[model samples]
Target chain A: MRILVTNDDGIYSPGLWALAEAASQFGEVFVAAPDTHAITIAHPVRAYPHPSPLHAPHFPAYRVRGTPADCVALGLHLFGPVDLVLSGVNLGSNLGHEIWHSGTVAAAKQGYLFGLSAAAFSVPLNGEVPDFAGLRPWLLRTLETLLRLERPFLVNVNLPLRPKGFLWTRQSVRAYEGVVIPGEDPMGRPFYWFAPRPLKEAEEGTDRWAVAQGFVSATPLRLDLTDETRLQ
Target chain B: MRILVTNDDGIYSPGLWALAEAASQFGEVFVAAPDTGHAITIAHPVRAYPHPSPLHAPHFPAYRVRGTPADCVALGLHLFGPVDLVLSGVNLGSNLGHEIWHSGTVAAAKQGYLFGLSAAAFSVPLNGEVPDFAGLRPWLLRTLETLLRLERPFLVNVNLPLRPKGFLWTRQSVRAYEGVVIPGEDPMGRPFYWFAPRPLKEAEEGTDRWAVAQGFVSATPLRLDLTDETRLQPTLA
Candidate 1:
């Protein structure tokens, strides 16, 4: 199985290299991640591919000029018919409702949208940062577990910086405490930074709870965004 | 009631005005939309408001920002304090299934979810010629009515494009399609490419795809959460 590994942290992130190493054992791994942190896919802007390609000793990679979703779409466009598309091993955790706008998870979703199976891997950058060298064995086990599943679905995996175990979890339906701090630039123009207060609650059986309890959270996400109960 | 009007099509689009007009009837409408077009996805480090402070008007003072749709919603929520609701779009096309993941129109509404507010994103699926803004008001009013008559709806994407049916309560379509890769040569004669996506078969009935396919207006209430619960019984259990 040929694996396509991509990320939102741009090509230069240490997380990208760690993820690449984790997946290299399963198949032929190709690195086609972003060149910049093209953040969210909230606009309809077109990001073109940069001419300069990265020549790492072990792999063939290209730094594209687009969001994480575009990288996967373009990866499928560039490297035809990969058996699986793997995204992330991101620096930040994509837990709970954050996946709605998370470029990391969106990359994997884009692959599924184009009829390819995919999964996204993210580890929170809070607390002690674990060595990627140490995280490799766990990553390998996680990939092996995810790949054994059926086709045409996307799973979002969130691990502790150092994971203890794995659990099949559901996406947390919790809200982040929003706080906007008003400050000024050098010119004294009013600018606000939108920061959510630390998570105040997590329901049992949720991805947040699982990760908080020292377990890796593998959440199988849904494509349908409908509120079925409301319709009922 | 203060209504925050925003869009991924930028604050300049005519649809913004139409939405503002329709909303102004109910209460105060403030425009804090994007300065430029933002299609979809999410985030940049700092989403600072643009220069040239928001000019006041009779009821529609516009404050445009230079960030993603999420930025506009966050800015609107923070600066405006407590707003009755948030409105986004009257976009260029229908934001269905997979499109929702990459939709800025929907992203604005998603931001509202975290802020403990409700938002609606409107779109006119570009069938052929762009329809004038004249036909947008009635749809807006009706959509507003439907939104209020239920449990708090968040991220409701409304498409006013018709097939044969009128407005229908629809679920998001489930889909995936083949991709398009247009290969070409650069100015230096090196091979270059542009990625294009091909369409899959249209959706099943009772879905927005079928609703739009029949030219019916579709009002789909999208959920903020993307967790697959049914699979838990079979796989995780």
Candidate 2:
């Protein structure tokens, strides 16, 4: 089966390369990702058209000028049908309720929207930059397990900042604790930064809890977000 | 009440102006929007450092910036305080299921996540480029009224494509739509062009259908928490 690989990190990112190398072993892997790093929650932006032609080394790698969702949209439309779509092994963990806005996870969700089984992989970054080399083996193992199981819909895989092992987990119910710091630039004008205060700790079994305890966090997410139980 | 107005469309957009004009009637309206048009599903990108300087006349009180839906979060937090919560749209179209991922309406909703207060807005764009704002006003007012009355948790306002008379309170439903691509290129080596496609019409009831079908508008309430935990027990077991 042909596997389409993409990420929120730009095309030249080490995380993208690490993910590409691992998926190459599974099947004919094609890498089409954003040209620049769109960290945090950059979703699908339908801007310029995608330019994905044959790249060198006979592997198809295209760089898009749009958001992660755009990449998936353009990838699925331009390229012929593929068996599965894989996003990320992203640079940062998309945890908690914040996953609702994460483009890393949304890219995979977009794939599911288009009727293909998809998944987003992310590893928490330490400091500003993450050491992708240290996390390679675990990502490869998680990718292999996902390929073996092949669940319908998109799964959000959050690898620990540093892991002891993998734990199948669920999203945390708690929200981030923080404040937006207000300041002014050199021009005496107002500026702001939304920074989360340190996490207030989570209970056991949650993705944050598992990650905190040194295990890879895998949460099978769905596109149908409605709470049907509430309707009943 | 001090209201901050914003949209995915750039400062010069007609939709943004329409929203600003409508919202101004309610309170003191301050427009802080992106410098250029940010369409589709562009979410908040981290602007670790923001230039908060207010721009010129046409941009007055309008702090046009290099940021995303998330940027508005930072601005809303720092600039305005002890004030009422943030108000996002009067967006050009509907931000429904799956489509929410790439929607600026939802992006503004996500920004409101930073502030614990209920974040909400209105989206009323149909499939066409130009939407009828005059026809959509009453539906917009009714949605605002419902939102004010209900004030539920994680509130997001969605106005479906329709005429003024046909506003229905509805839930978000997924419809089958396929995207198509036409090939072309710039003076540079690679090829590129517009990506367009039509959504497949499948009628699912109790959804945003009543509005879209009868040529009226639909308003929906969206929440931020996407976890469907009940399915976890059987699957994990």
The candidate that achieves the highest TM-score relative to the unseen native structure: 1
The local lDDT score (0 to 100) that residue B235 gets in candidate 2 is: 50
Task: Let me know the TM-score candidate 2 reaches against the reference structure.
Answer: 0.45
lDDT of each: 0.74, 0.66
Mark the 10 consecutive residues where model 1 chain A has the least summed lDDT: A48-57
* Deviating ranges (above 4 Å) for candidate 1: A1-232, B37-58, B162-165, B179-189, B193-200, B233-237
| lDDT over C-alpha atoms for residue A147 of model 2 | 75
lDDT of candidate 1 over A129-184, digit per residue (tens): 44666788889999889888988778999988768998999998865688999876
Error of 2 at A55 (Å): 14
Error of 2 at A210 (Å): 1.6
Per-residue accuracy of model 1 over B1-237 as CA lDDT, tens digit each: 788888777654556767787878787877787754342323334344432211221346667676778777777877876787888877757787678788888888777766778788888776433445555667677777777676764668888773334679899888777888988875556776779886677688988877877877788888766788777668553
* Candidate 2: true interface contacts recovered: 0.00
Model 2 CA deviation exceeding 4 Å by range:
A37-58, A176-200, B1-237
Clashes of 2: 10
For all candidates in order, state the fraction of native interface contacts they contain: 0.00, 0.00
